[PDB]
Symmetry: C2
Subunit: 485 residues, 2 copies
């Protein structure tokens, strides 16, 4: 006889409407509402499930006068259906209609009604009711959660449609994040900040063993983690300072990788961010504890290794509880500009970028030199342009960036390497953008560079190839530019 169309909002009705797609914990919640003195209204399968479990419930029909003060409604699993199937008609069937209208209408009437759209909130709601804490502020926070839920549902639908039919660049783009935590401050102490995630990447794969990451720590962790996880199971160590790499090495073991990464620039590593592709043991911990680093992120950390930093107050230690580092692979990238944002496909160093590169020179690089070029390419692509990266025997030996000219950047890189007492003879060089003139090769000959990898594409490419041939260097043109602001 009664339908949802005959139900209206009324404070003190002590009558709950329970109509859910996700039926998890609905029986116990219905039993707890009944014990609290609520009359229960329900539809379809929810009604049959409640009645079956001895709950006193009255059936109302779906639209496809009685007052209510609790609306417990959740939606058709659209997200789960799109992940599990490509059948478009099945996907359209899992678009909930009616459910969001009920959630949004109850939310707008929060002064008089409680709105529940998440089974994870049932136990909290019951305890609030038992403690006599169902006040206007409690219902206002449920109203905020309700509009976040319906906004997220339709944003997911719109993003999925635009990914399937408009190559991921639709008329309206929704960048939706779920808060992980607030940071102590933003880029500067006078700014507030927070970390947001698209799914569960940070929630599921990061555990703070000591301290709390700052806003700048997180962008530095991202950069160090992306570099140290780019070489499979190899014992990579990445050292980052102010968003740029200042150290990188792969050696026989993690302790040797750390000592050689640190050799490139000890000065900048003081207060840096260290990413370890493997176990942080007691030995590695003491080696790092010779200087004061701000952050250490390891795949897994030993108890004795954590104890080594009991003295340092501002050091932060993170674990992924994994044998090797786990990274995220976002398909799209975005940059804030005043008034909006620019959106694009994520840049990536292709697995066959060096393998498919054109050999331009008389000389071919050796197997060890090709490994060093691979390391140099990846560092250059992850570093903010215009840059030059010098790698020797699995370790970065010099890096230049930020200058108006790379000839000026290279001279600053060589100056730091001389200061560090590093032998650059036999090293390889990578740049993420083409070298415009042969002076780039002539400057490289001074330090005994043996192999070069660059995208190629200059009008003076012929004189660059000739200069490499004069010095007997290996030269590869990838045809892939990796500029990064």
């Amino acid at each position: 006889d009664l339908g949802t169309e005959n139900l209206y909002f009324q404070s003190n009705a002590m009558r709950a409407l329970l109509s859910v797609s996700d039926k998890e914990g609905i029986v116990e919640f219905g039993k707890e509402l009944e014990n609290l003195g609520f009359e229960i209204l329900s539809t379809g399968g929810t009604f049959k499930l409640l009645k079956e479990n001895g709950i006193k419930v009255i059936e109302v029909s779906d639209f496809t006068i009685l007052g209510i003060d609790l609306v417990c409604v959740n939606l058709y699993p659209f997200k789960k259906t799109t992940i599990m199937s490509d059948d478009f008609d099945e996907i359209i069937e899992n678009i909930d209609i009616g459910g969001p209208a009920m959630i949004r209408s109850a939310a707008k009437n929060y002064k008089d009604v409680m709105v529940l759209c998440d089974p994870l909130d049932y136990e909290k709601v019951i305890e609030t009711l038992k403690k006599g804490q169902n006040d206007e502020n409690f219902r206002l926070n449920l109203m905020i959660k309700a509009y976040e839920h319906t906004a997220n549902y339709d944003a997911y639908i719109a993003n999925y449609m635009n990914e399937r039919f408009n190559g991921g660049f639709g008329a309206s783009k929704f960048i939706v994040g779920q808060k992980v935590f607030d940071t102590k401050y933003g880029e500067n102490p006078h700014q507030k900040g927070a970390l947001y995630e698209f799914d569960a990447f940070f929630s599921a794969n990061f555990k703070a063993l000591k301290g709390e990451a700052s806003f700048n720590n997180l962008t530095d962790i991202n950069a160090a983690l992306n570099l140290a996880s780019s070489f499979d199971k190899a014992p990579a160590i990445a050292i980052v300072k102010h968003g740029n790499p200042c150290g990188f090495a792969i050696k026989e073991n993690l302790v040797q990788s750390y000592i050689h990464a640190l050799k490139c620039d000890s000065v900048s590593a003081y207060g840096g961010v260290v990413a370890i592709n493997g176990t942080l043991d007691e030995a590695l911990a003491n080696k790092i504890n010779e200087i004061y680093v701000e952050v250490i992120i390891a795949a897994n950390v030993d108890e004795k290794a954590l104890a080594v930093f009991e003295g340092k107050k501002r050091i932060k230690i993170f674990t992924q509880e994994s044998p090797f580092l786990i990274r995220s692979f976002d398909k799209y990238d975005f940059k804030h500009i005043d008034g909006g944002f620019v959106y694009q496909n994520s840049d990536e160093v292709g697995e066959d970028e060096l393998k498919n590169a054109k050999l331009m020179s008389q000389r071919e690089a050796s197997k060890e030199e090709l490994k060093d070029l691979e390391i140099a390419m990846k560092i250059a692509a992850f570093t903010k342009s215009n840059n030059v990266v010098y790698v020797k025997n699995g370790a970065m030996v010099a890096i230049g960036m930020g200058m108006t000219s790379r000839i000026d950047a290279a001279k600053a890189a060589i100056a730091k390497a001389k200061e560090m007492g590093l032998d650059l003879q036999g090293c390889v060089l990578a740049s993420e953008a083409f070298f415009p003139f042969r002076d780039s090769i002539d400057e490289a000959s001074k330090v005994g560079v043996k192999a070069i990898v660059e995208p190629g594409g200059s009008i003076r490419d012929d004189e660059v190839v000739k200069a490499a041939d004069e010095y007997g260097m290996a030269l590869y043109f990838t045809g892939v530019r990796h500029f990064l602001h």
Copy 2:
């Protein structure tokens, strides 16, 4: 009054349209065109009165959008059986099918009470039934819809693309509501954050040719305040425009000129007029200025256009451009010219900033150089800066704060004379800055210096003494700050500590 939404059903070939819109632009002509195509028209509230008033044959339906408060609007989610034309002739007023749904959406008690419930429910229900009904949420699509119908082009794919627009519209509405609630009650950092953009255009590519790119806007800032007079902006042009525009609009109505190359400033000046400001901005680094981006806080006239045209630049963005100034660049191909059709440059002033990291984003308040940052700074030295030196420090502070850190900015008589950045040390950055200034044949004696990070040792001051720096502005905060103060006192320099850091990655 008589008909209600409970009497309406989605039905293919019903030849009956429901028109109920907040944005009433072009609804009269669209209603007239639907009526000429043989559609019967149903309408509510203000839309009904507007249509009836303009001689359109329309029947009223109780207002479902406006607001005993019922649980949900009486909107049927299913479809009525599709009937043939000969079945309609052979043949009813209690059950009316609809095949076109044209609906679009618009004190704490006032905002909450005005949340539309019936409108989104109607839009979302029609959209799900796209195989049978047309859903219209954008007045910009009315003319296209009429031509599609006249040409017999209304097919399942056409209705599918309308369904996508419908869910973008209802997603945008609830995302704006959730963001407002979190701004009011959770300081703008809610449990779910929605960064929503509307596409302006696709760029030819992204940061690199192998990437696809596009420009998105919040509340139509780029659509309403930017007009391309010549060429098309690339993805990298847009981030360079942003940087040059933000600098040149930081001094109110002053005749600022900003020159940017690869996201960093390579020129800046404020002189008596825009022509003089350009001349003095270019002096700092003529070389990097080649193929750069120029932002003009005012009119680009024939005289200034002719002075810029002496070299090659990729982009010019001015507040307003004279016809004669645009004509100067008729021959060349590579240059791009933009206008804001305004007396002075217009910024958006976004309250929040965000950075992409894999798996998500970091979110924060937007940084800003406060109007009284230098005025409230502590004078640490013997010597106080003059009125002209304080103006130069203000310019140097703002350039340093907008430039990617760690940096050093040298300003003299309203013009930037040197800039150093990028490398691991600010002593290394300063030596590169002095080298470029010597190459440019610029006199640095009497200039001021700014850094938006504290100087850790007196060696920063001793290097500044070589070029005759007279005043320094820094946030302060080092251990040996008293040693940095002693050095500035030995050379007779003015030294200010603002206590505000502006680090920028």
